[PDB]
Amino acid sequence: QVPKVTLNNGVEMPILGYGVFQIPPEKTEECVYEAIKVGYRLIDTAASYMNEEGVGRAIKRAIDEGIVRREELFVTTKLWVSDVGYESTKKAFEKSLKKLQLEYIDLYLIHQPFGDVHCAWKAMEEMYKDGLVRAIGVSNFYPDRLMDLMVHHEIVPAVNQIEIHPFYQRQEEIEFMRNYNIQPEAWGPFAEGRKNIFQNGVLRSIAEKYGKTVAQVILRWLTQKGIVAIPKTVRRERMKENISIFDFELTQEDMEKIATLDEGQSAFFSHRDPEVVKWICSLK
Numbered sequence: 001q002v003p004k005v006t007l008n009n010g011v012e013m014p015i016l017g018y019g020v021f022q023i024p025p026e027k028t029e030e031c032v033y034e035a036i037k038v039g040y041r042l043i044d045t046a047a048s049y050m051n052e053e054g055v056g057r058a059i060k061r062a063i064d065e066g067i068v069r070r071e072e073l074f075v076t077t078k079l080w081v082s083d084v085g086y087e088s089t090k091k092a093f094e095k096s097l098k099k100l101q102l103e104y105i106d107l108y109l110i111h112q113p114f115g116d117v118h119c120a121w122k123a124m125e126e127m128y129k130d131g132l133v134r135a136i137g138v139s140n141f142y143p144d145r146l147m148d149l150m151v152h153h154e155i156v157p158a159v160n161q162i163e164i165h166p167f168y169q170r171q172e173e174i175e176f177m178r179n180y181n182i183q184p185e186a187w188g189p190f191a192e193g194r195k196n197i198f199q200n201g202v203l204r205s206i207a208e209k210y211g212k213t214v215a216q217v218i219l220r221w222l223t224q225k226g227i228v229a230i231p232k233t234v235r236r237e238r239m240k241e242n243i244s245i246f247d248f249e250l251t252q253e254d255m256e257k258i259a260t261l262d263e264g265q266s267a268f269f270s271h272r273d274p275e276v277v278k279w280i281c282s283l284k
């Protein structure tokens, strides 16, 4: 029984989904298919992961085998930096759509805050209004950048996908998003395992309390905040573990303990670091 959040346009999105970053293209079909069988419906990919084609094949099988209908799934993909523009953005979307073998996409995101994101958003608003995508949003946008879009365009981004985990908890940005009706979505909910997160003593003491794992506690913590989380694992047993978090609840005390862990900065790098902007823009 996986809860759904309601986005600013009335679209419902599952609060827990399945991420496919660093799953090799040739392993992505079986992973996604297994995830769906286990009960995932929110699937997160991107043009840049090079595994849309495998995601689409998993879906096609699940649908053909009767496991799900298309409407039960929530497929997210992303516009890569090098495609950002007006027509370039439509072309990119249509390329992803093809790879996925879908008629529509549930959520399409601007992947990075660089290049002509105003033209990309305008493009995206038009595909949104044409019915090609159910919800449009952004990724890795700080509040100033979110505001800039909001004051220059009609459609408020439905989602902003950003790094959120116990060591970068980003509460001030969450309340800015809640204020302006932008659903926060957590990428790297486990910080990709950085900083011995699965062995953190505070997290284990709370996990022990409930007979759950640390991973489960982290995801329960996010979702209990009203944050969509998209953990990634290539293991069937962890798919099952990661989705099995709604049969318990953290106390206020538990939530406050977890809050003490915030380090207030990325586990990876800052998007305001000019060297980072350049490194990202030079990947493709």
Ligand SMILES: NC(=O)c1ccc[n+]([C@@H]2O[C@H](COP(=O)([O-])OP(=O)(O)OC[C@H]3O[C@@H](n4cnc5c(N)ncnc54)[C@H](OP(=O)(O)O)[C@@H]3O)[C@@H](O)[C@H]2O)c1
Binding pocket: 018, 019, 020, 021, 022, 044, 045, 111, 139, 140, 161, 162, 186, 187, 188, 189, 190, 191, 192, 193, 198, 213, 215, 216, 230, 231, 232, 233, 234, 235, 238, 241, 242
């Ligand atoms: N918008 C963006 O700029 C951006 C950037 C990065 C990622 N993302 C999205 O966010 C998704 C989630 O983030 P992520 O892949 O970076 O990192 P993540 O989900 O925080 O953590 C990934 C790691 O956790 C391990 N793991 C999963 N479940 C576990 C469990 N219950 N116990 C112990 N270890 C566990 C995985 O190992 P195994 O796979 O081997 O189990 C994997 O190495 C991505 O796949 C992608 O869809 C978006």
